[PDB]
Amino acid sequence: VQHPLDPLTKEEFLAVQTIVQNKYPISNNRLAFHYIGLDDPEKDHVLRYETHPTLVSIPRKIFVVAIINSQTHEILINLRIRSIVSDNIHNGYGFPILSVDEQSLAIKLPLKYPPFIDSVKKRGLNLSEIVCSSFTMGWFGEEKNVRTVRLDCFMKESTVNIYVRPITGITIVADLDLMKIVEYHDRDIEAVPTAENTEYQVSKQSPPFGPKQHSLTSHQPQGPGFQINGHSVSWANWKFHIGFDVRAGIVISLASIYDLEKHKSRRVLYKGYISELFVPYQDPTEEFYFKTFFDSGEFGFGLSTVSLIPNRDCPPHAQFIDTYVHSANGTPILLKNAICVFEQYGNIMWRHTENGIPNESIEESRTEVNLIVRTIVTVGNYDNVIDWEFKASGSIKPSIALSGILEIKGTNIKHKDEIKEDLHGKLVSANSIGIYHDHFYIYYLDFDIDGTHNSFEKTSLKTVRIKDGSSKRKSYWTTETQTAKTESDAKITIGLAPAELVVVNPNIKTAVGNEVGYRLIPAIPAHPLLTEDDYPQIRGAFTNYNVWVTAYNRTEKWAGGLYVDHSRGDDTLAVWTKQNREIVNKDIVMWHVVGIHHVPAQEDFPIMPLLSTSFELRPTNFFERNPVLKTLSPRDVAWPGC
Amino acid sequence: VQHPLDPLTKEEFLAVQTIVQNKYPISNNRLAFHYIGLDDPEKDHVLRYETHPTLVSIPRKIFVVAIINSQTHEILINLRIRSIVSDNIHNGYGFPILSVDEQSLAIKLPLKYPPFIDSVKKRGLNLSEIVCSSFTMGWFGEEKNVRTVRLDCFMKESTVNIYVRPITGITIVADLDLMKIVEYHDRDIEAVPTAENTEYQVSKQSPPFGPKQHSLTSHQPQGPGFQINGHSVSWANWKFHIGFDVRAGIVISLASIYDLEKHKSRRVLYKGYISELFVPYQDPTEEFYFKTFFDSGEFGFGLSTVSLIPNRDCPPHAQFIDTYVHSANGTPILLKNAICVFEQYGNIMWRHTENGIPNESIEESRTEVNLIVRTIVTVGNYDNVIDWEFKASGSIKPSIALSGILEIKGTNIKHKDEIKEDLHGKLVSANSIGIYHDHFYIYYLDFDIDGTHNSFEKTSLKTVRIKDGSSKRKSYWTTETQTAKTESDAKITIGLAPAELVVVNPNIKTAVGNEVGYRLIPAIPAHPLLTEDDYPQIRGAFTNYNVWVTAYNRTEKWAGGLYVDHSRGDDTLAVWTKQNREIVNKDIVMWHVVGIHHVPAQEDFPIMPLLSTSFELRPTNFFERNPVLKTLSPRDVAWPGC
Ligand SMILES: *[C@@H]1O[C@H](CO)[C@@H](O)[C@H](O)[C@H]1NC(C)=O
Ligand SMILES: *[C@@H]1O[C@H](CO)[C@@H](O)[C@H](O)[C@H]1NC(C)=O
Ligand SMILES: *[C@@H]1O[C@H](CO)[C@@H](O)[C@H](O)[C@H]1NC(C)=O
Ligand SMILES: *[C@@H]1O[C@H](CO)[C@@H](O)[C@H](O)[C@H]1NC(C)=O
Ligand SMILES: [Cu+2]
Ligand SMILES: [Cu+2]
Ligand SMILES: [Mn+2]
Ligand SMILES: [Mn+2]
Ligand SMILES: [Xe]
Ligand SMILES: [Xe]
Ligand SMILES: [Xe]
Ligand SMILES: [Xe]
């Protein structure tokens, strides 16, 4: 019943807590769990299990990152035999994911800190309605290596929208290990933006409302087209596994599509997730220079996954999957409605109207039903709606949509005509600067296109000029396909030259002889605007290209490095690929960076309408012909479906 | 009841036919109507009519392009008084949109032409199962200016999928005025691809089918959220007018959004349509060198609009709008279900989960209902699904999706290993080359952002390096806004440098002082790969940039020129902008070129799954704040049961 790639259960978190506590009792040890996740089973074992799932036995192994007595420990546990197989101290740079508990403690410190109390009083602000939040500080060339954060504070009072009410102008640094403020500098007095009209909760808003949106009700006469057996999904011609990890968030594994013509299930994607985020702000002053969050490695995408609100975050009749996370003391926490799965209707699958045959009317239009797997991750002010969409046609469409709250920098300025220098953002409301920033996400995409042995092909589009009278045309374009030999050949800056980027299996061809493959259709690319030598850009060097390909390696999981808080950037994707390994006809992995540059506008305030992005992974000579040529539209059914 | 921008009614087409026949009787004149459309009412009159629609009287004026006795006539008619106001002969280069009737005659010619009959017999093909199609030939520097086309032929037999069964290797040129074949060269014998498994009609396919897709049934308890009064749509906070023209196809006009905070209807888009298409093939041999269709100007997007199939091309409960087109003799033809309007559910409008306030759980997620207006244009083998999507948030999202059939070049080659030279396409099936080609579409977007006096702003994102020790950061980015002064400043190649492109009203600002505007968020851009001096690229010079801005001019409607068939490219958007007019704080128009490079894959055969493209027009300081801050989700209703 339990699949080897399943997320950790309540029971497994408790056994981990127990096994680690046994070695390090809380009576004589300060013990904090900062990561508890499944140690990836060896791929060859997983592939053996797939073909004989009743026979192949894989032990559940757990990787744990724990701070014990102010030292970072890496602990591997075999849960079958309830033993610790290894326990090593991390000696390199960087620190684990911040825990929720230590943040909850850190944000109370300013409220009892006499210099903060005096700064607050001098501004005439109500101390009892201040909330603070912990921001990571990264690394800026210093040799000092301590677990410090910056604490920023905000007014609440008549609104819960705290992020639009900063108390701007105060430096507070807190050491999380010591749990105390180690630096304080009250620099500038800035007005706190009003609470008026910042409220986003319907219960706290007043009329008028509008425009009115008409309701819709719907029903599937034969129920859902997908079945979830534990974490294993069967839907239409697809099978895949839904996993979940406290750091990565959602993980799509073992994605295979049934080829009706060949009567065989065929692998596309062994493993797909978001490996890291990078959200660099563009305000170089003391107020914000340090704010370039790596959400996944600094806060945990899984740890920060929210409960989906039925009928809103997912359509009605969506099916929900609960997951478990853990707290700092190792206790499992139920995360209700962490993921949902639903079907989407209305799309045209394909069509043709034929009018070229005299005296014949021919038309055919068919519709598709698509599958969406959705999860939502909220880190502080940003909400990220993460979707994986599957289509019978074989396309997979990973998408990310952004909402939430702008990070506001407070200012005395009320109108644009008062601005006399670069504010490093747009004035989106009185006293409110929306600071310029980027969102970069990098996907790990372990394609095993019809098997593990794959290659990466760049199909360049090139212009040929005809000068020799051999045609009336002066020009045309044609393709020129190059196989990337090493990792340096697969570092692509999209938009420099026209090309299709394809992962193929060179060992498997269609009957006419084309290598089977999948191609990336990207959205308009964001490129880094920081300099390559800037400290946050070194740490976020995984954003240096839009696409990368590496040789598959178990231990290469996290693009910003295993330890991201205060990282020096000596363990990123950029660093790994300096080895310049061979990537021809072997197990390879694609990494794809997506992102936007955010120039805030007034529409983003006080809460922001969804901005949707997407890319498509499209079968490209994977099938002999259109895989949905023989796929029928869903039947028409008169309301109410009986 | 009749709005000035309404499409031509049956009655109006008949009056036009009558008026023109009365001056040019068919007893003494050869008369063909190639275009009959609404002569655009003057803008200042239309704006006056909007404010007083019961009082302002605009005469319906009709523009007609007719070939009369082998001369092209331009005829303007005032229908109120049933008179011809002007009748001028076109003396320049190029010819009108091909009529359906003359093509029907032209495609029969090969079947009675003894050299074709002999060429067909020599290949052993069944003459009674051959169908031919007329292809435009453009212009390639020759001084000759006649209405010729290339005729290509196809086998039918056990399939209606003719385009995948070419008879390749025969040149046939026919003069449409003379209605005869004026050139014939049988060059090469190529195998005709098999009919086997080319069928896309469900009634002509055999098992097995799959995967099974589950049905859905739906109902709106309070009916549709939109009303259509004639051609004027009211939905949510939008009003706009749906028009139709035999050349352009669908036209969206007078799009205004109600701003609840200001209690006022505010203009965004005066007029939006697809002005031209350009589909250059990349085979320079005698077989295809000439094939670079300008769909709209050569065949008519409106004339080529198909009837939408209920429940397939549009979801159930969509509302349909009939239009009229015309035949060559000027008779109105009813086009049932030419356009549909429906509402789309499921999207998150915005959300936030707040976890930063100790001991408080705060979450809010709202959904939006969006509006889709759809039409489908099929020219030969290509099907284009054209959508205009409106959102309560103010975004407009025009989209184009592509399906239909590949244009196949027949060949004796069965496997890729047999290929010894550039075939100018991919081998997608035995004997079947899918020839490389592009699709370029150009949109006319007459934004009148909260009024007619607008400017075009390029907000460049620039990297600044800090060297002088004033920050721990080495770098950041900021914005630099430049207003385009003249047309040369507004010719944008997207992807060269990072920037937001915004149309603003410089005379209207938000209370905090930002200019009201709308911004373009484009898809990954296609750029021309023909040389600029190639004959098709001169004719299609409107594709030379992704974005253009011109001063509003009534007569500048068609980006490839008024007369496209055999054009020399002396009347394109590129030519008009050599005037380099001023475009600061005045009535301006944006043109946006969208497109793809199509490298055919086997999945595209024998009929192709939908490839969807889109861009967003997003309000950018247009509103004081998030316009849907106070918009409530549609109410949830439980399935009633049985
Ligand atoms: C400060 O805030 C508290 C609520 O947390 C309120 O009871 C009190 O009256 C406030 N003080 C002032 C000066 O407004
Ligand atoms: C896997 O990658 C890491 C470095 O990123 C390295 O320590 C290890 O040797 C690699 N293993 C292989 C098989 O190359
Ligand atoms: C040619 O096709 C017709 C049907 O259009 C059929 O009746 C006839 O027998 C065919 N002849 C050959 C040579 O197959
Ligand atoms: C309006 O457009 C036409 C065609 O491009 C041109 O001949 C005319 O001069 C234009 N008006 C101005 C003032 O540019
Ligand atoms: Cu942002
Ligand atoms: Cu195409
Ligand atoms: Mn792989
Ligand atoms: Mn305008
Ligand atoms: Xe995004
Ligand atoms: Xe890919
Ligand atoms: Xe498209
Ligand atoms: Xe725009």
Coordinates of C-alpha atoms in Angstrom, one line a residue, chain B residues 42-391:
Chain B
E42 CA -15.6 59.3 -38.4
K43 CA -14.4 58.9 -34.8
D44 CA -15.6 62.2 -33.5
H45 CA -19.1 61.3 -34.7
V46 CA -19.0 57.9 -33.0
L47 CA -17.9 59.6 -29.7
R48 CA -20.8 62.1 -30.0
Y49 CA -23.2 59.2 -30.7
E50 CA -22.1 57.3 -27.5
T51 CA -23.0 60.2 -25.3
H52 CA -26.4 60.8 -27.0
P53 CA -27.3 57.6 -28.8
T54 CA -31.0 58.5 -29.3
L55 CA -30.2 61.9 -30.9
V56 CA -27.1 61.5 -33.0
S57 CA -27.7 60.3 -36.5
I58 CA -24.9 58.7 -38.6
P59 CA -25.6 57.5 -42.1
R60 CA -24.5 54.0 -42.9
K61 CA -21.8 54.3 -45.5
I62 CA -20.5 51.2 -47.4
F63 CA -17.1 50.7 -49.1
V64 CA -17.1 48.3 -52.0
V65 CA -14.2 46.8 -54.0
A66 CA -15.4 45.3 -57.2
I67 CA -13.8 44.1 -60.4
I68 CA -15.9 45.5 -63.2
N69 CA -14.9 44.6 -66.8
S70 CA -11.4 43.6 -65.6
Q71 CA -10.8 46.9 -63.8
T72 CA -10.7 47.4 -60.0
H73 CA -13.3 49.9 -58.8
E74 CA -13.5 51.6 -55.4
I75 CA -17.1 52.5 -54.6
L76 CA -18.4 54.4 -51.6
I77 CA -22.1 54.3 -51.0
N78 CA -24.4 56.3 -48.7
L79 CA -27.1 53.8 -47.9
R80 CA -29.3 56.3 -46.1
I81 CA -30.0 58.0 -49.5
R82 CA -29.0 54.9 -51.7
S83 CA -26.5 56.8 -53.7
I84 CA -23.0 56.3 -55.0
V85 CA -20.8 59.1 -53.6
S86 CA -17.6 58.0 -55.4
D87 CA -16.4 55.5 -57.9
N88 CA -12.7 55.5 -58.7
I89 CA -10.5 53.1 -60.6
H90 CA -7.5 51.7 -58.6
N91 CA -4.4 52.5 -60.7
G92 CA -1.7 51.1 -58.3
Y93 CA -0.3 47.6 -57.9
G94 CA -2.0 44.6 -56.3
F95 CA -5.5 43.1 -56.4
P96 CA -8.4 42.5 -54.1
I97 CA -9.4 39.6 -52.0
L98 CA -10.0 36.5 -54.1
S99 CA -13.7 35.5 -54.3
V100 CA -14.9 32.1 -53.4
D101 CA -16.8 31.7 -56.8
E102 CA -13.8 32.3 -59.0
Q103 CA -11.7 29.8 -57.0
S104 CA -14.5 27.2 -57.4
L105 CA -14.2 27.7 -61.2
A106 CA -10.4 27.8 -61.1
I107 CA -10.0 24.4 -59.3
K108 CA -12.0 22.5 -62.0
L109 CA -9.5 23.6 -64.8
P110 CA -6.8 20.9 -64.2
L111 CA -9.4 18.1 -64.5
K112 CA -10.2 19.1 -68.1
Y113 CA -6.7 20.2 -69.1
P114 CA -5.2 17.4 -71.4
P115 CA -1.6 17.8 -70.1
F116 CA -2.8 17.3 -66.5
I117 CA -5.0 14.4 -67.6
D118 CA -1.9 12.8 -69.2
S119 CA 0.4 13.6 -66.1
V120 CA -2.2 12.0 -63.9
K121 CA -2.5 8.9 -66.1
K122 CA 1.3 8.5 -66.2
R123 CA 1.2 8.3 -62.4
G124 CA -1.7 5.8 -62.4
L125 CA -4.0 8.0 -60.3
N126 CA -7.8 8.1 -60.5
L127 CA -8.8 11.4 -62.2
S128 CA -12.3 11.3 -60.7
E129 CA -10.9 11.5 -57.1
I130 CA -8.7 14.5 -57.5
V131 CA -9.4 17.9 -56.0
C132 CA -7.4 21.0 -56.5
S133 CA -6.9 24.2 -54.5
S134 CA -6.0 27.8 -55.6
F135 CA -2.8 29.3 -54.0
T136 CA -1.8 32.9 -54.2
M137 CA 1.6 33.6 -55.9
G138 CA 2.5 37.1 -54.7
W139 CA 5.2 39.0 -56.6
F140 CA 8.9 38.3 -57.1
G141 CA 10.3 41.4 -59.0
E142 CA 8.7 40.7 -62.4
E143 CA 7.0 43.6 -64.2
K144 CA 3.9 41.6 -65.0
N145 CA 0.8 42.5 -63.1
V146 CA -1.9 39.9 -63.7
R147 CA -4.3 37.9 -61.4
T148 CA -2.7 34.5 -61.5
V149 CA -2.7 31.7 -59.0
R150 CA -0.9 28.4 -58.6
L151 CA -3.2 25.3 -58.7
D152 CA -2.1 22.3 -56.6
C153 CA -4.0 19.0 -56.6
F154 CA -4.7 16.2 -54.1
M155 CA -6.1 12.7 -53.9
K156 CA -9.3 12.0 -52.0
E157 CA -10.5 8.4 -52.4
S158 CA -11.0 6.8 -49.0
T159 CA -10.4 10.1 -47.0
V160 CA -11.4 13.7 -46.9
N161 CA -8.0 14.6 -45.6
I162 CA -6.8 15.9 -48.9
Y163 CA -4.0 18.2 -47.8
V164 CA -2.0 15.1 -46.6
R165 CA -2.3 13.6 -50.0
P166 CA -0.6 16.0 -52.5
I167 CA 0.2 15.3 -56.1
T168 CA 3.6 16.9 -55.8
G169 CA 5.8 18.0 -58.7
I170 CA 3.5 19.8 -61.1
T171 CA 3.4 23.6 -61.9
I172 CA 0.0 24.9 -62.9
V173 CA -0.6 28.6 -63.2
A174 CA -4.1 29.9 -63.9
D175 CA -5.2 33.4 -64.8
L176 CA -8.4 34.1 -62.9
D177 CA -9.5 37.0 -65.2
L178 CA -9.2 34.8 -68.3
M179 CA -10.2 31.7 -66.2
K180 CA -7.6 29.5 -67.9
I181 CA -4.3 27.7 -67.3
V182 CA -1.5 29.9 -68.8
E183 CA 1.4 27.7 -67.7
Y184 CA 2.1 24.0 -67.2
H185 CA 5.3 22.2 -66.3
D186 CA 5.2 18.5 -65.1
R187 CA 8.6 18.4 -63.3
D188 CA 8.8 15.5 -60.9
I189 CA 7.0 12.2 -60.1
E190 CA 6.6 11.9 -56.3
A191 CA 4.6 9.2 -54.5
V192 CA 1.2 10.2 -53.2
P193 CA 1.1 9.4 -49.4
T194 CA -1.4 6.7 -48.4
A195 CA -4.9 7.5 -47.2
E196 CA -4.6 5.0 -44.4
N197 CA -5.1 6.5 -41.0
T198 CA -5.4 10.1 -42.3
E199 CA -9.1 10.3 -41.4
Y200 CA -10.1 12.7 -38.6
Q201 CA -14.0 12.3 -38.8
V202 CA -15.2 10.2 -35.9
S203 CA -17.8 8.6 -38.3
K204 CA -14.9 7.4 -40.5
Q205 CA -12.6 6.1 -37.8
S206 CA -12.5 2.6 -36.3
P207 CA -11.8 1.3 -32.7
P208 CA -10.1 1.4 -30.4
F209 CA -10.8 4.9 -29.1
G210 CA -9.4 6.5 -25.9
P211 CA -8.8 7.7 -23.4
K212 CA -12.4 8.0 -22.2
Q213 CA -13.2 11.5 -21.0
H214 CA -15.9 11.9 -18.3
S215 CA -18.9 14.2 -18.9
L216 CA -19.8 17.3 -17.1
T217 CA -23.1 19.1 -16.9
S218 CA -23.6 22.7 -15.7
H219 CA -26.2 25.3 -15.0
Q220 CA -26.3 29.0 -14.1
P221 CA -29.2 29.4 -11.6
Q222 CA -29.5 33.2 -12.4
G223 CA -28.8 32.8 -16.2
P224 CA -25.9 34.4 -18.0
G225 CA -24.0 37.3 -16.5
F226 CA -23.8 39.1 -19.9
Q227 CA -26.6 40.6 -22.1
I228 CA -26.3 41.1 -25.8
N229 CA -28.5 44.0 -27.0
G230 CA -28.1 43.6 -30.8
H231 CA -24.3 43.7 -31.0
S232 CA -23.7 45.7 -27.8
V233 CA -22.4 43.6 -24.9
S234 CA -22.9 44.4 -21.2
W235 CA -21.1 42.1 -18.8
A236 CA -19.8 42.7 -15.3
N237 CA -18.0 46.1 -15.4
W238 CA -17.5 46.0 -19.1
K239 CA -19.3 47.4 -22.1
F240 CA -18.2 46.8 -25.7
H241 CA -19.5 46.3 -29.2
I242 CA -19.0 43.2 -31.3
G243 CA -18.5 43.9 -35.0
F244 CA -17.8 41.8 -38.1
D245 CA -16.3 42.6 -41.5
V246 CA -15.7 40.3 -44.4
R247 CA -12.0 41.1 -44.5
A248 CA -11.0 41.6 -40.9
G249 CA -13.4 39.1 -39.3
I250 CA -14.3 40.0 -35.7
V251 CA -13.9 43.7 -34.5
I252 CA -14.1 44.7 -30.8
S253 CA -15.1 48.3 -30.4
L254 CA -15.8 50.9 -27.7
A255 CA -14.5 48.7 -24.8
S256 CA -14.9 50.6 -21.6
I257 CA -14.7 49.5 -18.0
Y258 CA -16.8 50.9 -15.1
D259 CA -14.6 52.2 -12.4
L260 CA -16.6 51.7 -9.2
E261 CA -14.4 54.1 -7.1
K262 CA -15.0 57.0 -9.6
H263 CA -18.5 55.9 -10.6
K264 CA -17.7 56.3 -14.3
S265 CA -17.4 54.3 -17.5
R266 CA -13.8 54.6 -18.8
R267 CA -12.6 53.9 -22.3
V268 CA -9.7 51.5 -22.9
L269 CA -10.0 50.2 -26.5
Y270 CA -11.8 52.1 -29.3
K271 CA -11.2 49.4 -31.9
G272 CA -9.3 46.1 -31.9
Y273 CA -8.9 43.5 -34.7
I274 CA -6.5 41.3 -36.6
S275 CA -5.4 43.5 -39.6
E276 CA -3.4 41.0 -41.5
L277 CA -1.8 37.5 -41.5
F278 CA 1.4 36.3 -43.1
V279 CA 2.3 32.6 -43.4
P280 CA 5.6 32.3 -45.2
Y281 CA 6.7 28.8 -46.2
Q282 CA 10.4 28.0 -46.4
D283 CA 10.7 25.8 -49.4
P284 CA 12.4 27.8 -52.2
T285 CA 12.0 25.2 -55.0
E286 CA 9.4 25.7 -57.8
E287 CA 6.9 23.7 -55.7
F288 CA 6.4 26.2 -52.9
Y289 CA 8.6 29.4 -53.3
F290 CA 5.5 31.5 -53.9
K291 CA 3.5 30.2 -50.9
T292 CA 3.3 33.0 -48.4
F293 CA -0.4 33.6 -47.8
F294 CA -1.7 36.9 -46.5
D295 CA -5.0 35.3 -45.2
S296 CA -6.9 38.4 -44.5
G297 CA -6.1 40.4 -47.6
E298 CA -6.0 37.5 -50.0
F299 CA -8.9 35.4 -48.8
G300 CA -10.8 37.4 -46.2
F301 CA -10.9 36.5 -42.5
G302 CA -14.6 37.2 -42.4
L303 CA -15.4 35.4 -45.7
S304 CA -13.4 32.5 -44.3
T305 CA -15.1 32.4 -40.9
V306 CA -16.7 29.0 -40.1
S307 CA -19.9 28.1 -38.2
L308 CA -19.1 27.3 -34.6
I309 CA -20.1 23.8 -33.6
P310 CA -22.2 24.0 -30.4
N311 CA -20.7 22.3 -27.2
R312 CA -17.4 21.8 -29.0
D313 CA -16.0 25.1 -30.4
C314 CA -17.8 26.8 -27.5
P315 CA -18.9 25.3 -24.1
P316 CA -22.6 24.5 -23.6
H317 CA -24.8 27.5 -22.9
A318 CA -22.6 29.8 -25.0
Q319 CA -24.7 32.4 -26.9
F320 CA -24.2 32.7 -30.7
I321 CA -24.3 35.6 -33.0
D322 CA -25.1 35.1 -36.7
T323 CA -23.4 37.3 -39.3
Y324 CA -23.7 37.8 -43.1
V325 CA -21.0 37.6 -45.7
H326 CA -21.4 38.0 -49.4
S327 CA -20.7 36.0 -52.7
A328 CA -19.0 37.4 -55.9
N329 CA -22.3 38.5 -57.4
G330 CA -23.1 40.5 -54.2
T331 CA -25.7 38.1 -52.6
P332 CA -25.7 38.0 -48.8
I333 CA -24.9 34.6 -47.3
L334 CA -26.0 33.7 -43.8
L335 CA -23.1 32.6 -41.5
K336 CA -24.7 30.8 -38.6
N337 CA -22.9 30.8 -35.3
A338 CA -20.1 33.0 -36.6
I339 CA -19.3 34.3 -33.1
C340 CA -20.0 33.0 -29.6
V341 CA -19.9 34.6 -26.1
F342 CA -19.6 32.7 -22.9
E343 CA -18.4 32.8 -19.3
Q344 CA -15.3 31.0 -17.9
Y345 CA -15.1 29.8 -14.3
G346 CA -12.4 28.5 -11.9
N347 CA -9.7 31.2 -11.9
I348 CA -8.5 32.6 -8.7
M349 CA -8.9 36.4 -8.8
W350 CA -6.5 37.1 -5.9
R351 CA -5.7 35.7 -2.5
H352 CA -3.6 36.0 0.6
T353 CA -3.0 33.7 3.6
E354 CA -1.5 35.6 6.5
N355 CA 0.5 33.7 9.0
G356 CA 2.6 36.6 10.4
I357 CA 0.2 37.7 13.1
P358 CA 0.6 35.6 16.3
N359 CA -2.5 33.6 17.3
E360 CA -4.6 34.8 14.3
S361 CA -5.5 32.7 11.3
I362 CA -6.3 35.0 8.3
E363 CA -7.0 33.8 4.8
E364 CA -8.9 35.2 1.9
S365 CA -9.2 33.7 -1.6
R366 CA -11.7 35.0 -4.2
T367 CA -12.5 33.7 -7.7
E368 CA -13.3 35.6 -10.9
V369 CA -15.7 34.9 -13.7
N370 CA -14.2 35.9 -17.1
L371 CA -15.9 36.6 -20.5
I372 CA -14.8 35.0 -23.7
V373 CA -15.8 36.1 -27.2
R374 CA -14.7 33.5 -29.8
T375 CA -14.6 33.1 -33.6
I376 CA -12.9 30.6 -35.8
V377 CA -11.4 31.3 -39.2
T378 CA -10.4 28.5 -41.5
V379 CA -8.3 29.3 -44.6
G380 CA -7.5 26.1 -46.5
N381 CA -5.7 23.8 -44.1
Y382 CA -5.2 26.3 -41.2
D383 CA -7.8 26.7 -38.4
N384 CA -7.4 29.8 -36.2
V385 CA -9.4 30.0 -33.0
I386 CA -9.5 33.8 -32.2
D387 CA -10.6 34.8 -28.6
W388 CA -11.0 38.1 -26.9
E389 CA -11.1 37.6 -23.1
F390 CA -12.3 40.2 -20.6
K391 CA -11.7 40.2 -16.9

